[PDB]
Design a protein around this ligand. Structure first.
Ligand SMILES: [Mg+2]
Ligand SMILES: [Mg+2]
Ligand SMILES: [Zn+2]
Lengths: 56, 221, 170, 57, 94, 227, 34, 1112
RNA sequence: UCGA
DNA sequence: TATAATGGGAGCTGTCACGGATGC
DNA sequence: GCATCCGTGAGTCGAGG
């Protein structure tokens, strides 16, 4: 799954191989889709989202 | 798929400790003297804290705030001192032609003092990536030539060769050994880390250095 | 203290490309003012420089053609955005300005980490490089999209964070 | 910096340390005009020393 | 990013040399009113207006685009300064 | 207060029968996605096309079996058959069965299918299967007119006992993507610019596809007529 | 308030000249005739 | 709406008057309602008693004083920029001892500023607040010597500027040293001067470690007190002739003189309690029968030796303890400066007495009031503790008045700041709030007084505790100091009580701040309330127990920054403190007694009480506050309405029906939205602007002066040279803008003409003059215009002209004109919003309603907040609030949750279910089933484990609703958000930081005198400071031309900047820069230091950067 | 004093 | 332009650690 | 050789009166 480190690595590699113009375009793309999907994902915070484990 | 878990794991927001304060116990707290209370808060922020607990935590919070506020000034002062000491250093030429260099160790003595162990990856990368080799290095059937700027893969490779026991240290051109007057040269410096390519002559590396050291000053705890 | 320099409250720029920033109409009007006078003189908007300036003096004397003229002025040019404190060289960056209504500066989401800027009420200062040399320097060297990697670590300094990472992960 | 999880290249610290190591102190003047205990730049004393060596002093 | 910036960084031995070249060329263009341009009419950078497409007022855009072509030459001591000035003034009056 | 709106120009940019871009600007605030989303839904669900619904192959029992003498399995063949673009010339025709019989050292293309009256294969160079010495392929494929996307276990059609149901890709449209950008006319600040991008298989063109999409929508607006 | 000796102010890159070929040969002929 | 309240804790006593720390202090200081003979020795009375009598006629004595009535009312003071004050008269009598002649008169000492009812002041027409200072209480302390581990330092501290700090140390050589004014001398000497003999000291101190031999010096006991006195004088005063009377005078003045050396009343109390002695006076010793007698020193030395030896019952002191730290309130500070001014007056008196005719002298001839007047004026104007009042909202004022600073005169320098000071001490409990304190440099210095906390007569802070006897909690409340508190075991306020008896077998309590589990048998006292632990602002945060302290701080602090909104609402979820804050702030207007309301008007309310008397209350309407926020009261009652005592009459600013309203209650959804809420940014709905939510009035004051000039008078006139009728349109006959007109940047407010400086027209001006044939006008346009980015509707105009009744201005000024311009500000992109939980953000996007995420019934949300703000900030209260808000949305009801005794999860769940019935059952009755999209979302939640599988759609929807989540539809698509989203009512305020005030830009403008660099500030149309660090930035980038451009063309290069502007307007590239003027200033300033700074070429031949202008 |  | 008059008087305080001169 | 006093430094930008 794509997270901070993997995405960072992607940006570095893309910088190296494809150069900074294409890396810029890639960054803008990632920004766009990241935002768009995060909107509809359903992510929220309720008080029940902090889950007290029984084990406690 | 729980929101807290997801945000924490993805690196979007949060760390295990804050999450722990939310769903867990708040934990141990320090007295104003730095001494720790024997009685921890057993309550999370979800459950809510008793007024006594809250008060106990306020000490630590305040101490932290004061610490940060006092820290910023010293960080700034240090940064300015660095800027002042390094400001005349700029890359003034392509090669100073020095035969001098430094050897970056890939291995460090263990605290048990039992043997030598491999240094952490990030550390090696920190002392290696972008640097120019001062000597020929032959490892794992690969030729790394004198004058070669080490890419990331070159560094990872050297790490592999070290794990294979072929090389314990890497000769490299460094500003410590650079003979360029009033500044450094291109080779002794190496990559312009922003561009991942050899540094352009005229880059002021003194100011970049000072800023690079100073900037995460207020982060140091 | 310098001339041709504004400041205002920053606001998130998500629609912006990496090389861009929202610059309010009025801020740019003032910052670019001499260029705006010259351009107003080039078109039929004003007989001369002085009349043009007297025209920009009162707000109810200002008309759309001067806004379009201002748009013609800024074309290709960039401005420098800076946030205090400036800890390293990325505390100042170059952005091709995009004229916007309202009083707020729009900043690109990806540079917020390097500026250590957020939306809690931070403000940023604008500076207009004047000479063709200053402009060349700003555009080649100081452009946001031209520095993607930290001069310190060497790692990418412009990378997904927050909502972006969250979505892609999701 | 490692402890706080700040990745920082050895290069910069080397620049600074170099700038700390910029200077030297005379332990004997030899044939020079200098003085015992006089502090000066390593570059200047190396230039002077190569001048005195080239001069046969 | 500036279009083809990687190639431009590929052209010089130091990025700042590129910068100087671009800026100087842009000043040449401004002083002569673009009459000295090495860009063919189709290669002209255009600005969208309310009327229609016109020439790009930005001499730096022009400069980088010209530089990309290969029709420009850069280097140190190619010609005495006053000679260059007077020759460009001869070919393209100001 | 008083508002006057200029007519909005419609623009098109096409590459072949495959791809096209569609630009509509300026539009009033919000109308960018007001037009955008429905057309996208319509373009993906409702655009008439042809699909491979069912496939029978001799001496082959189920979908996960293996074919002796042929390199690609039953799965891979069915996949290749999903990418077959077949066009019905006669508007009357509701379905066709296509036959293919070949053997020996040959690579079967979409050309190998025996031609049917008013049935055009747009992609005859599409690969089906590679056969070896002693390899034998006898297959009958069903092709129906429909819309959208129907999984194999929904339509669930069989002409015979060993006929395999195939996930039916009816939609001639492979993708629809739209983006609304802010645009200005004079001092009108918030106006919308709609840019639509449409990928098809070539049987129907993007422009034709969009024209069918707007027609469908308009036709639905007429459903508000008679209580 | 002078130009700093770094970047675009470096003595290495600052003396660089730019000339379009069309003018270049035009000067070259002047150098050729003398 | 029905307001449901939770919590089982019954508050025995209510909160004390919240402004009392100010009011009672100043009242105690003035004693203006007390007959002069009945007054005590405290206050300005103390000051008079200290100063007088004045001797060496040769005698002037003080009898009594009196305060007259204020020459002007408060409002009139605010109008005329005067000070609200009362005339101070003093009865004095002059006595010549020989003649016996007695001349008695009442002298006028000037005026003393009077505190208003709310506890503020008016100084030069501006409201101000005197902030209480905290410091180390005077007394005797014993501290561990940081150097020598087993050795200690005794320190005797008097009041600030009441005389010197004295140190008693045991030196490495064994002798005990005394340190005064940085002089180390053997204590034995002073002990001899005090009249002690070796026998007395040996029998007194002998029991300790045989340490007393360090106190034994034969050369000291070999001389009588006189010789030792002269010896000590020679030791403390080198070069000064050792005359006997001079030594007696100096030593007495240093130690026994009450007119110089003063311990506090608290000083002497703590001295007595610590050393186990009694003090006759407040000094360290006395002059009695010609000789010096000891008070302090011997007990002090005794305790010191006792602590050093290890004798039980002796301990060091915690100087951050709140028993050793006291508070100087308004009355004490004012008393101090009063004392100083009085002493200066005394010097004036003694200087006047020697001169002039020795026969005829009235008190009037002796007394010059000017020094006293100047002292008071200084204290009320330029002091650090006298602050411009923050009146933004009523809570701002209140909190301001409740502040405690460790800074200021007699207080710590920032540099002196250390953690130990800024720390939260264990004794801050119930006294000083652990939460409210600034972020940044000032943290731990500026603090706030706790809600129940009180400052006693000795300056210490006290907190109430309930008396517990044999497991039974009484209603008797005892306010204790920290020293007193440490003596007991004190239970928590939440401990279970059946009736008045403790119901728990194990009860949580405190012994010396340490938490301990004890029995009810052991419980001596019990807390009054959780409210007592925090400040007033912190007490306003619901679900405070669920918020991390660091963010709670921000919420508390940010409430102070709330702008009063025309539509303002009390929070859906309250803490129960919102009514008191309105009351004690004197914001709203209440009913004095029972009665019937006669008249109700926008401008006034008339009430007939049970007396039959008609009382007319005028209403403050659209008054401009210190910060420019509109303060106005609106009538809440109607004609004939029957009212009781304490019933609401008018609502003040930021008040809804008597409850504090700092903001709006909005429907909020917590979801990311397309990166517009990215990093704390906020997305709002246009429907908020439509209905005027987050819209507030703001008034700005503009001012101009027409004065007398040597070149001729400035005059306000409608005749302004070279201006069209279009320009003068809204100006009246006199040249002042009309009331009701709309002004935009560039418009004229007050027209003014000034005579030009002497003109020597340049040949161009003369030729142009001849060409157009128009005489150059005598005067020129100085008119006050509207500053860029400002404007509004003209409300008031004030004109004060010389030669007119009641009017006298500063010398040279003909007239002064003030134009008041208001504006109604809606919410815009860039404005700052916040909640009570520390969530703060700028509005980055305003969406049209159809783009807003909406409920299935079609209801669009107002604000969209990003969930990414919650976890890192660890403030869950705002979540909980929203949940309850949600219920309150569908039940149509508000709530009161005592912080720390609030609404638990289960009860909120109950309310949420009750709400769900309303939200859903209505739908099912309306003839609608479950939506397809809702089915999809439910499927998505089942995978999330947010709902139990197999239950009906309605049951699952209720399951989600109980968790506070609902189905939300995207307005752009119509498709649901794949998950259920948290949605509910949240209380959110617009803060005082608005993009309208902060947006600024400059091309060219005014430059500084010497440096010729651009001025700073928006008001000055200044430039942005490009600092050393920005230069570092540009350097690191390597852009030399941009940098040099900043250093020259854009700042101080005059030729360069003129040539730059000309180049740009001409359409030319900017010319190469030249030497910046400030470097020339550097050179010249170095020359004045007698240093030759020479700019040289490579040939070492000088280069003149002054161009020959400075060279002969 | 406040903001970042 | 003339009795005679003759040594002042506010300091004022919760840091802090470095370096480089000054005395047992 | 080792206490001691003295001088000098102790984050940026912005707001308001
Ligand atoms: Mg911020
Ligand atoms: Mg729009
Ligand atoms: Zn080198």
């Amino acid at each position: 799954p794509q997270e901070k480190n993997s995405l960072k690595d992607l940006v570095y590699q893309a910088f190296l191989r494809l150069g900074m113009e294409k890396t810029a375009r890639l960054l803008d793309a990632l920004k766009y889709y990241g935002f768009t999907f995060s909107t509809t994902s359903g992510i929220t915070i309720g008080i029940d989202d902090a889950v007290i484990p029984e084990e406690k | 798929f729980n929101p807290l878990y997801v945000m924490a794991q993805s690196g979007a927001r949060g760390n295990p400790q804050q999450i722990r304060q939310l769903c867990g116990l708040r934990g141990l707290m320090q007295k104003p003297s730095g001494e720790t209370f024997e009685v921890p808060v057993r309550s999370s922020f979800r459950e809510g804290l008793t007024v006594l607990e809250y008060f106990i935590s306020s000490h630590g919070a305040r101490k932290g705030g004061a610490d940060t506020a006092l820290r910023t000034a010293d960080s700034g002062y240090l940064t300015r001192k660095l800027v002042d000491v390094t400001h005349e250093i700029v890359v003034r030429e392509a090669d100073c032609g020095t035969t001098n260099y430094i050897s970056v160790p890939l291995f460090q003595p263990d605290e048990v003092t039992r043997s030598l162990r491999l240094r952490k990856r990030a550390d090696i990368e920190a002392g290696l990536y972008g640097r120019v080799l001062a000597r020929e290095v032959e490892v794992l059937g690969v030729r790394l030539e004198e004058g070669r700027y080490l890419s990331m893969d070159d560094v990872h490779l050297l790490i592999k060769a070290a794990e294979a026991g072929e090389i314990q240290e890497v000769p490299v051109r460094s500003p410590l050994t650079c003979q360029t007057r009033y500044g450094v040269c291109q080779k002794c410096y190496g990559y312009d880390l922003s561009m991942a390519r050899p540094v352009s002559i005229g880059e002021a590396v003194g100011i970049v250095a000072a800023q690079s050291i100073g900037e995460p000053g207020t982060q140091l705890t | 203290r310098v001339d041709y320099s504004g400041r205002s409250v920053i606001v998130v720029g998500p629609q912006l490309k990496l090389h861009q920033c929202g610059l309010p109409k009025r801020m740019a009007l003032e910052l670019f003012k001499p260029f705006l006078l010259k351009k107003m003189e080039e078109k039929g908007i004003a007989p001369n420089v002085k009349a043009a300036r007297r025209m920009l003096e009162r707000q109810r004397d200002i008309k759309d053609e001067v806004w379009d003229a201002l748009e013609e002025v800024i074309h290709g040019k960039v401005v420098l955005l800076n946030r205090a404190p400036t800890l390293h060289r990325l505390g100042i960056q170059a952005f091709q300005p995009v004229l916007v209504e309202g009083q707020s500066i729009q900043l690109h989401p990806l540079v917020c980490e390097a500026f250590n800027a957020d939306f809690d009420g931070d403000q940023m200062a604008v500076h207009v490089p004047l000479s063709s040399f200053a402009q060349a320097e700003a555009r080649i060297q100081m452009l946001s999209a031209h520095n993607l990697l930290s001069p310190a670590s060497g790692e990418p300094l412009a990378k997904p964070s927050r909502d972006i990472i969250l979505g892609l992960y999701y | 910096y490692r402890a706080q999880g700040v990745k920082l290249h050895d290069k910069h610290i080397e620049i600074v340390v170099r700038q700390m190591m910029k200077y030297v102190e005379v332990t004997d003047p030899g044939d020079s005009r200098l003085l015992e205990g006089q502090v000066l730049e390593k570059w200047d004393v190396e230039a002077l020393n190569e001048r005195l060596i080239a001069e046969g002093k | 990013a500036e279009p083809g910036i990687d190639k431009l960084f590929g052209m010089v031995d130091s990025k700042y040399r590129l910068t100087v070249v671009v800026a100087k060329r842009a000043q040449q263009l401004l002083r002569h009113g673009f009459k000295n341009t090495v860009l063919e009419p189709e290669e002209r950078p255009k600005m969208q207006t309310l009327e229609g497409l016109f020439d790009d007022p930005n001499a730096v855009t022009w400069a980088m685009k010209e530089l990309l072509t290969g029709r420009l030459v850069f280097g140190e001591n190619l010609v005495p300064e006053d000679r260059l000035q007077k020759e460009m003034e001869r070919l393209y009056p100001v | 207060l008083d508002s006057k709106l200029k007519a909005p120009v419609f623009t098109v940019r096409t590459q072949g029968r495959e791809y096209g871009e569609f630009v509509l600007e300026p539009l009033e605030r919000g109308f960018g996605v007001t037009l955008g989303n429905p057309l996208r839904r319509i373009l993906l669900s409702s655009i008439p096309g042809t699909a491979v619904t069912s496939v029978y192959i001799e001496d082959v029992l189920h979908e996960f079996s293996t074919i002796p003498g042929v390199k690609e399995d039953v799965v891979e063949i069915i996949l290749n058959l999903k990418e077959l673009v077949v066009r019905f010339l006669n508007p009357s025709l509701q379905t066709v069965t296509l036959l293919l019989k070949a053997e020996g050292p040959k690579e079967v293309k979409a050309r190998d299918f025996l031609p049917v009256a008013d049935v055009e294969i747009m992609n005859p160079d599409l690969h089906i299967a590679t056969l070896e010495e002693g390899g034998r392929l006898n297959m009958e494929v069903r092709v129906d007119r429909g819309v959208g996307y129907v999984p194999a276990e929904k339509h669930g059609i069989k002409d015979r006992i060993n006929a395999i149901p195939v996930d039916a890709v009816f939609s001639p449209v492979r993708r629809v993507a739209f983006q609304v950008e802010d645009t200005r006319l004079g001092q009108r600040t918030d106006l919308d610019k709609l840019t639509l991008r449409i990928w098809t298989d070539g049987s129907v063109t993007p422009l034709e596809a969009l024209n069918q999409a707007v027609e469908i929508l308009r036709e639905h607006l007429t459903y508000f007529s008679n209580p | 308030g002078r130009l700093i000796p770094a970047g675009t102010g470096s003595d290495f890159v600052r003396f660089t000249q730019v000339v379009d070929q069309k003018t270049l040969k035009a000067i070259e002929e002047a150098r050729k005739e003398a | 709406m029905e307001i449901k309240r939770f919590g089982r804790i019954r508050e025995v006593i209510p909160l004390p008057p919240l402004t009392e720390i100010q009011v009672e202090s100043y009242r105690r200081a003035l004693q203006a309602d007390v007959p002069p003979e009945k007054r005590e020795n405290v206050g300005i009375q103390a000051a008079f008693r200290e100063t007088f009598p004045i001797e060496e006629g040769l005698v002037l004595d003080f009898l009594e004083y009196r305060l007259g009535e204020p020459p002007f009312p408060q409002d009139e003071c605010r109008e005329k920029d005067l000070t609200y004050q009362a005339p101070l008269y003093a009865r004095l009598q002059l006595i010549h001892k020989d003649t016996g002649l007695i001349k008695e008169d009442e002298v006028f000492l000037g005026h003393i500023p009077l505190m208003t009812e709310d506890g503020s002041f008016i100084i030069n027409g501006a409201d101000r607040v005197i902030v209480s200072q905290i410091h180390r209480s005077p007394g005797v302390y014993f501290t561990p010597d940081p150097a020598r581990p087993g050795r200690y330092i005794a320190s005797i501290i008097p009041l600030p500027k009441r005389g010197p700090w004295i140190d008693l140390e045991v030196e490495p050589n064994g002798v005990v040293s005394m340190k005064v004014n940085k002089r180390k001398f053997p204590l034995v000497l002073l002990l001899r001067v005090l009249g002690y003999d070796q026998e007395t000291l040996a029998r007194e101190l002998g029991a300790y470690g045989e340490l007393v031999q360090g106190l034994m010096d034969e050369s000291v006991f070999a001389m009588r007190p006189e010789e030792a006195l002269i010896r000590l004088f020679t030791l403390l005063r080198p070069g000064d002739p050792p005359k006997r009377d001079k030594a007696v005078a100096y030593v007495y003045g240093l130690i026994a003189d009450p007119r110089r050396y003063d311990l506090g009343e608290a000083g002497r109390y703590k001295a007595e309690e610590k050393l186990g002695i009694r003090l006759s006076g407040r000094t360290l010793a006395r002059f009695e029968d010609g000789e010096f007698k000891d008070e302090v020193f011997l007990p002090t030395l005794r305790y010191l030796f006792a602590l050093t030896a290890g004798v039980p019952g002796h301990e060091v002191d915690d100087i951050d303890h709140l028993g050793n730290r006291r508070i100087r309130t308004v009355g004490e500070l004012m008393t101090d400066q009063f004392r100083v001014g009085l002493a200066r007056l005394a010097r004036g008196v003694r200087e006047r007495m020697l001169m002039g005719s020795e026969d005829s002298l009235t008190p009037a001839k002796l007394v010059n009031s000017r020094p006293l007047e100047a002292a008071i004026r200084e204290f009320f104007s330029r002091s650090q503790l006298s602050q411009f009042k923050d009146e933004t909202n009523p809570l701002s004022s209140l909190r301001h008045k409740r502040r405690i600073s460790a800074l200021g005169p007699g207080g710590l320098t920032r540099e002196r700041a250390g953690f130990d000071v800024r720390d939260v001490h264990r004794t801050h409990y119930g006294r000083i709030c652990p939460v409210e304190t600034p972020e940044g440099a000032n943290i731990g210095l500026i603090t706030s007084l706790a809600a129940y906390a009180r400052v006693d007569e000795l300056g210490f802070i006290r907190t109430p505790y309930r008396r517990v006897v044999g497991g039974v909690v009484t209603d008797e409340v005892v306010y204790m100091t920290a020293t007193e508190e440490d003596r007991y075991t004190i239970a928590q306020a939440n401990t279970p009580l059946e009736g008045n008896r403790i119901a728990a077998e194990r009860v949580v309590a405190r012994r010396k701040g340490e938490p301990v589990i004890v029995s009810p048998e052991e419980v001596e006292f019990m807390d009054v309330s959780p409210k007592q632990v925090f400040s007033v602002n912190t007490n306003l945060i619901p679900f405070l127990e669920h918020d991390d302290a660091n963010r709670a701080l921000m919420g508390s602090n940010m409430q102070t920054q709330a702008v009063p909104l025309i539509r303002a609402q009390a929070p859906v979820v309250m803490t129960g403190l919102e009514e008191r804050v309105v009351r004690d702030s004197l914001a709203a207007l209440y009913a004095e007694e029972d009665g019937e309301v006669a008249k109700v008007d926008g401008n006034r309310i008339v009430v007939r009480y049970e007396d039959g008397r008609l009382v007319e209350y005028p209403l403050r309407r659209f008054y401009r506050s210190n910060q420019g926020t509109a303060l106005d009261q609106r009538p809440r009652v109607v004609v004939g309405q029957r009212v009781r005592k304490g019933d609401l009459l008018a609502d003040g600013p930021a008040s809804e029906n008597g409850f504090l309203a700092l903001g709006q209650n909005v429907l909020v959804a917590i979801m990311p939205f397309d990166g517009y809420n990215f990093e704390d940014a906020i997305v709002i709905s246009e429907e908020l602007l439509k209905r005027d939510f987050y819209t507030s009035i703001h008034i700005e004051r503009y001012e101009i002066e027409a004065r007398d000039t040597k070149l001729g008078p400035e005059r306000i006139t409608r005749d302004i040279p070279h201006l069209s009728e279009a320009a003068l349109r809204d100006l009246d006959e006199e040249g002042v803008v009309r009331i009701g007109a709309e002004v935009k940047p560039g418009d004229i407010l007050v027209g003014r003409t000034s005579f030009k400086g002497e003109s020597e027209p340049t040949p161009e001006e003369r030729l142009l003059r001849s060409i157009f044939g128009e005489k150059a006008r005598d005067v020129k346009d100085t008119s006050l215009r509207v500053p860029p980015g400002e404007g509004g509707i003209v409300v008031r105009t004030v004109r004060l002209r010389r030669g007119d009744p009641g009017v006298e201005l500063k010398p040279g000024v003909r007239e002064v004109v003030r134009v008041y311009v208001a504006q109604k500000r809606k919410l815009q992109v860039g404005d700052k919003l916040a909640n009570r939980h520390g969530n703060k953000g700028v509005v980055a996007k305003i969406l049209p309603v159809e783009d807003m995420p909406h409920l299935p019934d079609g209801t669009p949300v107002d604000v969209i907040l990003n969930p990414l703000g919650v976890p890192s900030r660890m403030n869950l209260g705002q979540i909980l609030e929203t949940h309850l808000g949600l219920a309150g949305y569908f039940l149509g009801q508000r709530y009161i949750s005592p912080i720390f005794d609030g609404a638990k999860e289960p009860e909120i769940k109950e309310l949420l279910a009750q709400a769900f019935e309303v939200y859903f059952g209505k739908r099912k009755g309306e003839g609608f089933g479950v939506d397809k999209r809702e089915v999809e979302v439910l499927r998505r939640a089942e995978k999330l484990g947010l709902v139990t599988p197999g239950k009906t759609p309605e049951e699952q929807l209720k399951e989600l609703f109980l968790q506070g989540k609902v189905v939300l539809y995207d307005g752009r698509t119509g498709e649901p958000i794949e998950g259920p989203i948290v949605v509910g009512q949240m209380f959110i305020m617009k803060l005082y930081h608005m993009v309208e005030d902060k947006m600024h830009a400059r091309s060219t403008g005014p430059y500084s005198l010497i440096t010729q660099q651009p001025l700073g500030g928006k008001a000055q149309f200044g430039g942005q400071r490009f600092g050393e660090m920005e230069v570092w930035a540009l350097e690191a980038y390597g852009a030399a031309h941009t940098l040099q451009e900043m250093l020259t063309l854009k700042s101080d290069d005059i030729e360069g900047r003129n040539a730059a502007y000309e180049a740009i307007i001409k359409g030319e590239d900017v010319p190469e820069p030249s030497v910046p003027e400030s470097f020339r200033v550097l050179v010249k300033e170095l020359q004045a230091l007698a240093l030759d700074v020479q700019t040289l070429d490579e040939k070492d031949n000088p280069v003149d950067i002054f161009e020959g202008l400075a060279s002969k």
